[PDB]
Design a protein around this ligand. Structure first.
Ligand code: GDP
Length: 301
């Protein structure tokens, strides 16, 4: 098994994968049309699941209407095939927008399948509210998250980014790139005192502490302060280049701790904090911000 397999799904996924090209080898792409393909998609790393046009309206409903029910109908028979062509790694990262129809159905469907096979999985996702469609789909995706946790009986881990009004998608994408780079490092199995089983136990915290299975949020923090401010942590993994200064025995006992080689890594410390996720809180925010946008009728010049 590769150490980390990344699955880029739908339009946002393809765009991020394009930006991430060269940062990791074991990546792949899945979509419901060819329209999002770019120079790095090939038959070896890309699967396209399309309506058998042997269906103009249905494709329009999926592609332009972003009808998630229609999209999920289209892709559901092919999910096990995807995992067969693009085998799961020791860790897996699935990347998708919540507001469209392809990523927001392929992605969580894949996460569910992989978790049912016992795999460690993280999603890096994007909430949006640029339209009524985006808002409704993003709300639906939050509920899909709870269904993945319930169906697969493994906590679905969500690293959440939001398309805030006035912030270019290119800057959200760059934040996602930094997260992807951090995860690849965390998962590379090259650090002292951090093995495959340590990461598996951090992610599948339900098998080791018996908190109920629930959807959870992953926060990636690049300094001690960000990490500490996170409310009610459930499971934390931390990587330090200066344990002599920063790591006590209490930290080792209460946290998934690893030592990164200061001869090789340039960061001080990285914290990967899993805590509870309230889909209700995120839905309300998206709705409030959509209303504020509607009332503003404003563009940043
Ligand atoms: N941050 C970010 N958002 C995106 C990107 N592409 C699309 N979006 C937003 O994601 C939502 C769904 O788009 P998309 O991923 O293309 O839909 P899909 O192909 O059906 O899964 C819309 O709100 C888009 O504005 C991207 O590259 N970066």
């Amino acid at each position: 098994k590769v150490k980390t397999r990344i699955y880029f799904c739908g339009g946002a996924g393809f765009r991020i994968g394009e930006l991430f090209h060269g940062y990791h080898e074991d990546v792949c792409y899945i979509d419901t049309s060819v329209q999002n393909k770019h120079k790095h998609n090939t038959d070896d790393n890309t699967i396209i699941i399309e309506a058998d046009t042997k269906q103009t309206a249905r494709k329009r409903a999926i592609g332009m209407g972003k009808d998630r029910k229609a999209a999920a109908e289209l892709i559901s028979a092919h999910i096990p095939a995807i995992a067969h062509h693009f085998p799961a790694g020791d860790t897996n990262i699935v990347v998708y927008s919540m507001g469209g129809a392809s990523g927001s159905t392929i992605g969580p469907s894949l996460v569910s399948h992989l978790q049912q096979q016992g795999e460690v999985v993280v999603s890096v996702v994007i909430g949006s509210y640029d339209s009524d469609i985006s808002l409704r789909n993003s709300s639906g995706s939050l509920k899909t998250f709870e269904g993945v946790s319930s169906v697969s009986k493994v906590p679905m881990i969500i690293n959440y980014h939001e398309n805030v009004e006035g912030i270019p998608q290119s800057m959200v994408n760059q934040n996602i790139l930094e997260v992807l780079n951090a995860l690849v490092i965390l998962f590379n199995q090259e650090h002292q005192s951090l093995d495959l089983m340590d990461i598996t136990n951090w992610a599948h915290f339900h098998k080791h502490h018996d908190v109920p299975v629930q959807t959870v949020q992953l926060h990636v923090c690049f300094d001690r302060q960000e990490a500490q401010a996170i409310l009610d942590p459930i499971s934390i993994a931390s990587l330090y280049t200066d344990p002599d200064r920063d790591v006590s025995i209490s930290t080792v006992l209460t946290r998934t701790t690893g030592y990164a080689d200061p001869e090789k890594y340039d960061f001080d410390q990285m914290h990967f904090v899993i805590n509870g996720l309230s889909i209700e809180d995120i839905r309300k925010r998206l709705e409030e911000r959509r209303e504020m946008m509607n009332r503003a009728k404003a563009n940043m010049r």
